[PDB]
Amino acid sequence: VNSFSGYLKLTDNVYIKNADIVEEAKKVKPTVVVNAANVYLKHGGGVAGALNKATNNAMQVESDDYIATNGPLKVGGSCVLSGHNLAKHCLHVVGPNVNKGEDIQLLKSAYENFNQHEVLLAPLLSAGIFGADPIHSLRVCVDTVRTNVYLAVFDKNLYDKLVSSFL
Ligand SMILES: OC1(CNc2ncnc3[nH]ccc23)CCC(F)(F)CC1
Numbered sequence: 001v002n003s004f005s006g007y008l009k010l011t012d013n014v015y016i017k018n019a020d021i022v023e024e025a026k027k028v029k030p031t032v033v034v035n036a037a038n039v040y041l042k043h044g045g046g047v048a049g050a051l052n053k054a055t056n057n058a059m060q061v062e063s064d065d066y067i068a069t070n071g072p073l074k075v076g077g078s079c080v081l082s083g084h085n086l087a088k089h090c091l092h093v094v095g096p097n098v099n100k101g102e103d104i105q106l107l108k109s110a111y112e113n114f115n116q117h118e119v120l121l122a123p124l125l126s127a128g129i130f131g132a133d134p135i136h137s138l139r140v141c142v143d144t145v146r147t148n149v150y151l152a153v154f155d156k157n158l159y160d161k162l163v164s165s166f167l
């Protein structure tokens with residue numbers, strides 16, 4: 001039993017809610033919140049810009065030190081950093097950005113990172129400003145993640161379409 005509330009159950013391990021992931025994180029304070037990161041951990045917009053803003057830019061400061069030490073992530077890769085005031089940990093995961101020409105096949109590799117964590121609050125990888133089809137992202141999530149994932153979908157219209165079209 002966990003403190004996630006109001007989710008629709010899609011499968012044994014995947015749950016979905018129309019919610020602002022920032023507000024969800026502030027309420028639940030989950031062990032792991034997933035960020036929709038890029039390889040440079042530049043949290044300018046989308047989910048990443050919103051999460052960083054909620055940390056008063058502390059996420060960006062920590063991320064800049066991480067990159068200065070380790071260099072960029074791989075597309076499909078991840079790193080674990082602090083969750084600041086939002087969660088114990090933030091798992092920064094890089095899905096492919098279609099608006100950069102990146103291979104959508106890397107989306108499965110990106111979701112595999114979730115399997116290293118028993119429970120996660122997460123957005124749909126490569127959705128929004130990363131330019132992939134969110135219906136596809138949900139399918140890859142369900143077919144790849146085996147741990148317990150609570151998906152927050154900001155757009156109510158998109159949430160309804162994802163539910164109604166789910167196989
Ligand atoms: O949810 C999407 C990503 N964007 C966010 N998700 C959750 N919380 C957020 N807070 C700020 C941005 C943001 C991905 C699926 C979609 F394409 F259907 C709607 C957008």
Ligand SMILES: [Cl-]
Pocket residue numbers: 046047127128129130
């Ligand atoms: Cl977005």
